[model samples]
Structure formats: structure tokens, C-alpha cells
Target: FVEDWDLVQTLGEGAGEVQLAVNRVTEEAVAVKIVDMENIKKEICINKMLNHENVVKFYGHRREGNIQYLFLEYCSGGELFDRIEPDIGMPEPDAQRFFHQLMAGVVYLHGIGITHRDIKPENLLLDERDNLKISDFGLATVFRYNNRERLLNKMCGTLPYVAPELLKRREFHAEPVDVWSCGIVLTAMLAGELPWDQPSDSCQEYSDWKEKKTYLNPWKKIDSAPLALLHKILVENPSARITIPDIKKDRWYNKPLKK
Candidate 1:
């Protein structure tokens, strides 16, 4: 299958640099992700199972002696991070639309027992229509989620988006950690910058927000509806942090968008 693809250009890099490729037979463009052999198995296992519209589709995979090649959906509009304007950020309506689509994808993943340990703006791609597509599953894993509390000891993910409990290196569940990162992503979409360099007590901005319950520059005057929802989702305590279902049920999330 990979033999039918002709390499075009490098799209971008994360776990690995993505190559823009075209199908020799059909001429359809697709992204080719070549990953190191050591981690390819895990990446393929997690990615191929995902089939949500808001999530990137995995066509299949192949191995060339050592390296592994993954065929993925090609998104032309670039990453969400590239689109965020410096000081102005994105309008509430636009951010809301993206966040809702992201949540839908995350919810689908969680529902199917997958945990996307890394959920940040860089991993989120946009199509020609500007629809959000969650990408990059290098840090993802499958977990069992029953009524009992499940804890995973793996401490991994992008620093700024990692959950506080994960930073502590304590046993943690997958869903909550992903939810925490989603909260951070929402804030970034609104403020056009990370809420803090880190979520630990060492970060003064994070501590101040936890103690005084206030937002810093570029986000001080956001309307109450979304602000209240953000407060719920960005909570430091994992137990108190809002879940995906909670996000969908929130009044602000369900509110009719303004034209």
C-alpha cells in the first residue's frame, strides 16, 4: 500500500515528521507518518481504532524493514496553534465551535476505552473547511473504565497541558488527565496563549488563579457563561474537574451560538 504513495513534502512534526503524499493510483492526497520502530506498534494500535468524524482517520500501516509508516487523513488548514492570533485570540463563538468538536472526539475516544494522553493545540489539525480534527496518538493508551477507580502510573504528556495529578506522578486515571488537557486547550483557544507555563504550585499564575480565582491578562474580561465553565473544567483536583459528559451538559456549551 505504501508503495502506491508518492512523497510530496513534510507537513509538520510531533512524535515524528508527517510527510505529504499522494496515492499513485487515485491521486488522493494523504499524510504519511513515519515513526520509529520502537513506538510504532503502540501508536498504530491506538490510532487505527479511532473512527470519529472529529478525529483523524487512520487508513492503515506498513513497515519498511525497521521504520513504520502510517497512512492518515490529510488536513490542509494546518494546526490550531498556527491559526491563533497573538493578542486578540479567537472569538468566543469560534473557540466554542472548535471546543465542542474536540469534546465530541474525546468523548468518543473515552467511550471506546482509549485515552489520548496528549491533547494540545499542536496535535489538533483543521481541514479546508476549518473543522477541528484531533490528531497524534503517540501518547495514547487503552484502559478499562468500570465503576471502580482505575489508576495509570505512566507520567507522560506535553508539560503545559499535563494534568496536575500527572505532574505529581501519582496513580491517575486516563479520562481525567485528557479532560484536564482539554481545559487547557480551551483556555489557549480563548486567550491565544497557555494559561501558565505549568499547572503546579511553582507557577505563580497557576497558584494565584487557584487561590484568588481570577484570570490574568488577555482573559480578564471573558463573559461569565464561558468563564464559569472554564473554572469548572480547569480545576486542579482531579475528582472535582469536570468530565466530558459534564462539559456537554453545561449551559454555556449547549447555548445557541451568536451570528
Candidate 2:
């Protein structure tokens, strides 16, 4: 329960050593993250308990003297996010598969009262079964515990994928913000580029979206099927934005992927 530092503090610059580690006993390969071990609090507290096929499995942690290491299920398919070509995103079916996979993790997180507050392309990872495991719980926080809800603030996560409310510096429920990020990720998957630099008045593209302009760069890239869902997901109002169950009910959500 005691950790030198919270995962959020040093995950970005705190990363010390990372490599493939082979367990001598099981002969199993794992991606070992050596923090040199500073903040190992939430990442472990959250990761170790998360159970989902689409989630990258945390095989537990170890510390040797001053250094600390954590083992993660090795995922060789690292190309999902890395391989993306800006302005030329993946195919509809491909994007949907990844999107669906990402949602699976999202659902799991929210169910357990955790809101990533940092759901974005970089944080989305791939696993053995081509399932998109939501990684990097460094920024995740508990918004709901036992039934009462807690509002969140402080503006964590990438700008482009942030919800509009986050820009206004208003304290709001944490859950919807992640939904907004997921919406933006969907756009990136279709357009190979972020729809706007950031979801704010300053971003002209966002202005266009705010005005509900029919013709848009990223909008143009998306086809009619997904366009409808994006309309629901990318809404400016936090609560008004589509919820997971609603998204599930969307026709496109059920569309089967084409190889």
C-alpha cells in the first residue's frame, strides 16, 4: 500500500528502464518497467485488480535494493498506435474493431469507478489477440467509490482529446470526459488525424464542430455510418454526449468488421 511516488508523477519522465524480461521459472516473457521504482501506487493498485481479456495483464511487481520493476503481459503487436499514419487513419472496420476493443476496457474501468481522464491514442495499446487494451493508468483516479460520485478537476490528459468542459476549468464529473476522449479517438481512427488541435474556442476546427458545420476535414474523412455516432459522442455538452449503453445501441456499433 505504500509507494515512493504515485504513477502519475513520474510515468512520463520517471520511466527509467524498460525491456523484455524472461521469467526463469515459467520461461514466460514479460515487459518489465523499471521505475528505478519511485511512484508505484495507483498504477499497481489499479492495474493488478483489473481483469479483462482486452486489458494488458499486470503480472505483479518486484524491488531489488533501490530499483523497482513491474511485469506486464508482453504484447508483440505494438503497431496499432505507432503504425497510425496521420490524416490517413485505419479502415472503418479496423477502426471499429479497435474502438470496440477500447470501449471494452473503458466499460471495465468505469464499472470499477475509475475514470482514466487520459484516454487517448497514445494510451491505447494492443494485446496478443489484437484486442486494444487501455494502458497507462498513471492518470487514472477513482471518481466513484461505493455509490457516491466525486467530481474531478485539474485538467489531466492530452489537449486535443480533452472534453470542452475541461477547458473552461469547471469541476465536472470525470466519466464524461473520458467519453469525449473516446469520441476524438474515433475521429482519429477514421481521419488519421485529430479533428482539432484542441477542443476549445481557439481551435477553428472545434469552432466548426461547435457550430455543427457539415463540411469538416475529419468529418469529411468519416463515412455516413460512423458520422452519426460521432455526432452523438462528440457533443459539447458532457451529459448530453452519448453514454456507453447508447453507443452500444447505435447501429454502427453492431456492424461486423470486414477483414
Candidate 3:
């Protein structure tokens, strides 16, 4: 086994807001993630210990003063966000495969008492085999002891992808919030663009936009299967929005694709 290591820059600087890398550890490869203690805590450690293959493998965490270094599995392709383009989205087959895999990972998380409060394309990664693995448990919490209901920080995620409840009130039903973010991600996958990226006046305006479930450009990019899936996703009431199981039943997902 190799003992020394060298870091290579696959993508130039500013690749993402977070510090990430592909490490050539003398010979083999491993992804190195440097997490700030201020940004997260040991909760991420506990959450990842209950590992699932669909979820990125957390090697171990090392800390120096205020920073926490987490070494995880190396995924070559980078984030799913890299794939979104104005003229193109993930191929229908590929998108569906990713979505279904994501759902499986999330279901596993919830089953294990974990709630990934912040779920977005940026947080989803593709491994060497291009398998979708849910990454970044910075905002995840294990609610099993807490009955799975917990209040969240106001500053949670990107303005567009955040759940309306997180914006409307400081406190929210976190499990549902996770579901909503997944819905937005699914829509972004099908449409090739973020639905909430447009300019908005205030939080209330954003809420109204979400409640209306309006997609830009009249939903021309999405097809029948995804359109139907989006309808259940971008709903006004969080209580009424689609659940993971419900999403599994979507005509688009009736026969989930194989990887």
C-alpha cells in the first residue's frame, strides 16, 4: 500500500464554494474534503458512520484547530450541478437512474434516523462508476432520539432550493423540508434549470412563487413523465407535496431504470 500522497488539481481553482479534491495517494486515488468546524460538527461523523453504499463513504475525520478534515471516497465526475446546461439536461434515462438511486439513499438515511436538511444538486455526487451517492451531511441531523422533529437555522440553503417552511418560519417539520428539496432537485434534473433561480422581491414573494408551482418557459423542456412528477413536487402546501414513496409511484418511476 502507498504511504505518501500528492494532490492534483483536476479542475482549476474556485471549482466550488467548498474545498474538494482528487488525491493521488502515492499511487491510488481518494477524495479529500476539508470541512470547517464552524460550518458543521461531529454530528456529520455520527450520521456517516451508519454508512450506505449509495451515500459517500466517510473514511475518517481529522481536525486542526477550527477546521475539520473529512477524507471520503473519490468520485471523478464531480457534482451533478456540472451537468446542467441551458440547451441540455441529463439524458432522461440517466436522470431517472440518478433520481431513483437518490431516493433509495435518502430512504436509507431516514430509516436510520438521519435527515439531510439541505438536499440539492450540489450535494449529490457521482462516484468512479458514476453511481449517485448522497454527499455533504453538514446540515443533516439524527432525529431518532428527538422524535425526528427539530427546528433549523434560518440560513440553511440557497434561496431558490430552500423549503418554503424554512423561509416562512424559523421552525419547520424537517423531514418534509428534506422532501421538498428533493422535489426541487428532481425538477432541476428534468428541466435542466433551477426553478427558483429568478429574481424575487421578498421571502413572501418567494413563497408565492413556490406556492404557484410555476416553471419558467412554460415547462417546454420537461416531458410527460417528468412534468407529471414535477406537478406533485412543486406544490403549495408542504403537507400535500409528494413523498418519496409517492415519487416512486410516478409513471416516470413506475419502472425505475437500472444503472
Candidate 4:
């Protein structure tokens, strides 16, 4: 398979980002992330374990000297980041569909004992049909092994999407944190941006929400139908946060799309 692929334009070259490439023979497009042998082994290991319709497919990886190449499924629709502009949200139906797909991905990952530490718009991709595909496992970590669980450090993600426990510098369950990001993603989809820059007292919007003193711009944008689920998912206490099964059981989650 060596030299069978041709490099395409850069998709993203920032930390933990991937590039676009093609199979020379098949002319098939794929997103590729090349690592100079840094902290990528865990990603490869975790990526190899995932299997779900909403999760990005991992083709395989190649190693040459200190460089490692990871091939991932390419979604032609576009990156979710492109739509995350503030004050302009997707229609309710569109947001619901995307949120459901994302829940599917999160359910699969949590079921398999993994947590996508960096769940954000940049990591969420879309195909031609607008199907959401959760990607970028470079920051993922195994919270469960041999049927045992442990708390992870408060790290690994964009600040706005991070949960309260993380900001408080407390060790926490990995699953709930992912759910927190899921809530953040959902809110962004409905509100077109995050409610705050961080989920701590440092951010007035977040602090106001926590104190029940106000609903920020993002909160104001979402209809009441999904607000309950958001409340459950975005709980400050990780243990009190909603889980995959609980989320699936939510009325708004199963409600028909509004668009």
C-alpha cells in the first residue's frame, strides 16, 4: 500500500487535526492525520476499537520511521464548525437530526468504555446526507478496562465544551464529561455558539445560569422542548449528569423533528 496514496490539500494541520488525501488507484478521498510519533498511539488503539454509523470510520494506519499516518473516513457534506456562527442556529428539525446522530455516536463510544475527550464542532463531520460523524479520537481515553473504571484528570478539550468538574480541577468520570460536551454541542447547534467561553465562575453567563439568575443568549435560543434534556446533560455534578440510556429516554430526544 506504500506510495498508493496521493496527498490532497490540507484539511487542517493544527494540533490533533487531519489532512485530506486520496487513494491513487481508486481515487477515493480520505482524511489523513500524520503524526511525528508523539502521543498518537492511544488514538490508534482507540480508533481501532470503534464501530458505529455515526462515528468516523478508521481505515488503518501506516508507520514510516518517526512518522505515523492515520486514514479516516471523509464526509463530503462539510465540517460542523462551518455552521457554528453565533446568533444563527439551524432549524429545529435539522438540529434534532444532528443531535440524534451525535447521541448515537456518544452511545456507542460510552458503551465501549471510551470517552471522546475533545467533542467539539471541529471534530464533528457531516456526509452528503448531512449525517453526523463523530471524529478525532486523538484526545480519547479509555475510562474502563477489564470491567473496572477510574476517574480521569481534568483535561483534554476546548474550554467552552469542557464540563464543570474539569474546570474545577477535580478528577472525574470520563463518561459524564463526554455527555457534558454532548450538551455543549447540542446547545451550539441550537444557539449557533456556546453560551459561555468556559463553564466556570470566571464566565458570567455560565455563573448566571448556574445561579438561576439568567438564561444566556444560547439558552434563550433553544426552545423548551429540549431544555430539560440540556438541563440533565449539563449538570455541574458529574454524577448527577444524564447517561446515554437516560438521554435516549428523554421526550425531546425522541420527539419528531420540527423543521
In candidate 1, what are the lDDT values of residues 48-122, reduced to their tens digit?
688999999999998788778899999999899887777656888898999999998998988888888889988
Residue clash pairs of candidate 1:
none
Ranking by lDDT: 4, 1, 2, 3
Ten consecutive residues with minimal summed lDDT in candidate 4? 211-220
For each candidate in turn, the TM-score is 0.93, 0.89, 0.80, 0.93
Candidate 1 TM-score to native: 0.93
In model 3, the clashing pairs are: none
- Candidate 3 global TM-score: 0.80
> Which 10-residue window of candidate 3 scores lowest in summed lDDT?
10-19
Model 4: colliding residue pairs: none
Assess each prediction's global lDDT (C-alpha) against the native: 0.84, 0.79, 0.68, 0.84
User: Candidate 1: which stretches are off by over 4 Å?
Assistant: 1-3, 145-149, 213-215
Q: What is the C-alpha lDDT profile of model 3 across 80-179, one tens digit per residue?
A: 8877665466677888888888889989888777787778887788887778888777667766654545455555666667776666665666666777
Give lDDT tens digits, candidate 4, residues 201-258. Answer: 7788888778765355767778888887888888898888888889999999989766
lDDT, candidate 1, residue 227? 77
Full-model lDDT, candidate 3: 0.68
Preferred candidate (lDDT higher): 3 or 4: 4
